[PDB]
Structure formats: C-alpha cells, structure tokens
Design an enzyme around this catalytic site. Sequence first.
Site, mmCIF file in Angstrom:
data_model
loop_
_atom_site.group_PDB
_atom_site.id
_atom_site.type_symbol
_atom_site.label_atom_id
_atom_site.label_comp_id
_atom_site.label_asym_id
_atom_site.label_seq_id
_atom_site.Cartn_x
_atom_site.Cartn_y
_atom_site.Cartn_z
ATOM 1 N N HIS A 79 0.815 -1.215 0.000
ATOM 2 C CA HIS A 79 0.000 0.000 0.000
ATOM 3 C C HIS A 79 0.846 1.262 0.000
ATOM 4 O O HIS A 79 1.977 1.300 0.536
ATOM 5 C CB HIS A 79 -0.946 0.023 1.206
ATOM 6 C CG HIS A 79 -0.259 -0.040 2.537
ATOM 7 N ND1 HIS A 79 0.248 1.072 3.179
ATOM 8 C CD2 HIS A 79 -0.012 -1.094 3.350
ATOM 9 C CE1 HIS A 79 0.790 0.699 4.328
ATOM 10 N NE2 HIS A 79 0.659 -0.610 4.446
ATOM 11 N N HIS A 122 0.593 -5.610 2.832
ATOM 12 C CA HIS A 122 1.368 -4.893 3.834
ATOM 13 C C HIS A 122 2.712 -5.586 3.992
ATOM 14 O O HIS A 122 2.869 -6.743 3.641
ATOM 15 C CB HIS A 122 0.654 -4.990 5.188
ATOM 16 C CG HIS A 122 -0.802 -4.590 5.168
ATOM 17 N ND1 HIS A 122 -1.231 -3.336 5.540
ATOM 18 C CD2 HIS A 122 -1.926 -5.293 4.869
ATOM 19 C CE1 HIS A 122 -2.555 -3.277 5.463
ATOM 20 N NE2 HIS A 122 -3.000 -4.450 5.040
#
EC number: 3.1.3.3
Lengths: 211, 211
Positions: A9, A150
């Site tokens: 992200h 992540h």
Amino acid sequence: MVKLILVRHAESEWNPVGRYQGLLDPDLSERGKKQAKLLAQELSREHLDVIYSSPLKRTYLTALEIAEAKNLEVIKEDRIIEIDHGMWSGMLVEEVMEKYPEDFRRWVEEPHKVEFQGGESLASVYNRVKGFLEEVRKRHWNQTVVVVSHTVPMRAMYCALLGVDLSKFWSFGCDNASYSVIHMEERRNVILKLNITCHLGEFYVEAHKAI
Amino acid sequence: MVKLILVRHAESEWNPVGRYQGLLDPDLSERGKKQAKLLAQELSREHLDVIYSSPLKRTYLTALEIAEAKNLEVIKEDRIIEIDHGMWSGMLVEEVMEKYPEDFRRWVEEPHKVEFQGGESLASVYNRVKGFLEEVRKRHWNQTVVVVSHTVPMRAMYCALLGVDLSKFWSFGCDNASYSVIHMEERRNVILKLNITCHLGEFYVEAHKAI
Ligand SMILES: [Cl-]
C-alpha cells in the site's frame, strides 16, 4: 504461469512517524494518495486480470486506484490483511523499544518466533498468506494477478513463494507503493523484480526499520 | 553495513539468440553498449567506493562505463566470472535441449547438482562467489561496492546472501544491465531491490529462459 504483482500500500498517515498500525485503519497520507496514482499509472500499462486487496483503507484505496485505471473490481481478501500487532498497535517504534525491549529484540532478530500479545503470530500470517497463494496458483493460471498488502504478510509471502524458512522474513525490501513481479511457474516461483519504486519519482520514501 | 550493488553485464552479441557463452568472450551488442551508458548514468548519482568486475569483455566494458566519471579503477575479479559451461559453450539453448536432454533437464530442475562436462559445477560457482562476498563484507564495511557479473554467479550470490539452499538458484530475476541493491547488515543480508531495469527504457530486454 501466474504473473503475480505484489504491491505494498501507499503511505498511510502513520507511516512517516513509524506508528504500528496492525489491524487499525488510518487513511492514506496526501503523499500516499499521490503515490497510489503514480503506481496505478505504471500498472495500467499492462494487462491485469484480477486485483486482490487487504480490506484496510490504506491497501483498499491503493487497490482502487489500480482497479479504476483498468475498469476492474477490487476483491477484498482477509488472508492478506496486516498482522495483528496486538498491544503494539498505536505505538511508535521508539515507544515499543522502550517499553517492550525484549519483545522488540525478538521481532528484529527472530521474527519467525514472535506472537504479538493480544494479537497474531508471524507463523499464523505465513499460513494464511500461503493458503491464499496456493489458491491463486490454481485459480489464476495464465493470468496477471495484483495483490495489494502490507510489509508483514508480503515478507511472509516471499518466504512461502521461495520455499525458504520464515526466519528469512527481514531479507526483502518493501517500500510504500512499490511492486514486485513474481512468476508462479510450473516447477517454482521466481521473483523477477523486487520492490520497484521508479514510478514514484520524488514521492519515493524509504521504509522504516522494524516495520 | 555494506551497500552491495549487483549488476548484470549489458547485452552481449550472444544474448539475443540465446547462445551459451560460459568463458567465451563476445563483445557487447550495440544495444548493450547503450544499456551500459544508461546504467552508468543511473549509478553516477550516488557515492561508489569500489567496482569489482568479472574480467570478461561484456562485464568489464559495463563496469568501465559505470566507473567513467566517477574516476574509479575497475578491479578485475576471477571469483565472479561466468560459470564454465563446458560443452554447452557456443550452443543455442534449443540445440542443448535436443542434444543433451537429461543434462538440460537437470540444469532447469536441480541446478545445484549440475557439473558441466568439460566445465565447472554450480557448487564450485557458489563456493567462489560466497568466499568473495565474505571478503567484501570484511573489507568494505560502511562502503558502497558495485559487483559486475553474470546470471549464474549472481544467482549463486543471492543464495549465499540469503543463507538459503543453492537449489533456489532460479528464483531470482537477472536482466542485462540491471542492478540489485543488497544491504549486508550486522545480522543478515537484505535484498532491498532486485533486478531494477527502469533506467533502460526502450533498450530493456527480458532475459532468456535457461540462461
Ligand atoms: Cl505499514
């Protein structure tokens, strides 16, 4: 083969200060919103079949920029969600170093042994991401698959993909709004490109230690 | 820490047709000469302490471009020379596949077990690049070190750097005139960036299978 594009992200509001996010859900920073657009423009230059995202805002908003650029839906995927950092969630790195120095040491030296108090173990992350990747390999053969996730689950994914010990967790770069290109081939998985950030230009930020 | 920048030589005249080079010494292609300049322009933006190169022309010419205008002397290093492909040297991939099908299969399936007839074993390559890397870690702590080499020694280097089995050989991308960034840290080696080629633009070429 599967062309697997593994994306971290874009920058969240907590990334510049190094605050542990876990399952908590801050927005993208303004810089991160710009990063997400730049990453989406880069990925739109090629054919994408499917986009999976962790359901948290930081990942989902990054995935939406990629998806909008190609007229695709984002499929929310719990198996690639951030590790549950438990009691560290909301703490600065320096706060964790001061309050929980022995747990911090274990994280940085022996991550594969860690189980966050009130949260999740790294082994649990490895198991869920590997099950996801095995299902992707079966379902999406001959397709290009974007996975927006992540650092923690992504590093676990690299270990799973290579078939190497989870103790190798820290050995893979993972910057905000970067992408890696993995070919899931008949006999093995190949990391063709790792942690590409060239598209970010001046909005490139090097990742914090211990995140 | 050592900032290790691992570079594959620019395209040789034998790379587009997939002819096994080994210790044979072809020139860079016209495209390769341009690639070496583009890679040089990318690395000149930062501080380099030392450049090691395989002594073969394709690697040495690439290393010279990177050094020009950093006023560095390229240090020739035999331990990072290409594998001796023995009898395959000078053959096309498709010719090797037909003439030596079981040896080709062993190369693609179980590379760690291979010894080229009239040439070198992959175990030998791993042993020499590992010793080179161990010496670099000692000698060049707190420095930036460029290593200009070939796919086979470079893949062996990634295995040594990660502390994983040589059987993982094929799992790392390695395009002509690419660079990878590895931090050799106190407790581990970290692959921060693998197989970056963004600087190449229109002169980018994807690497051939089985090379
Ligand atoms: Cl994060």
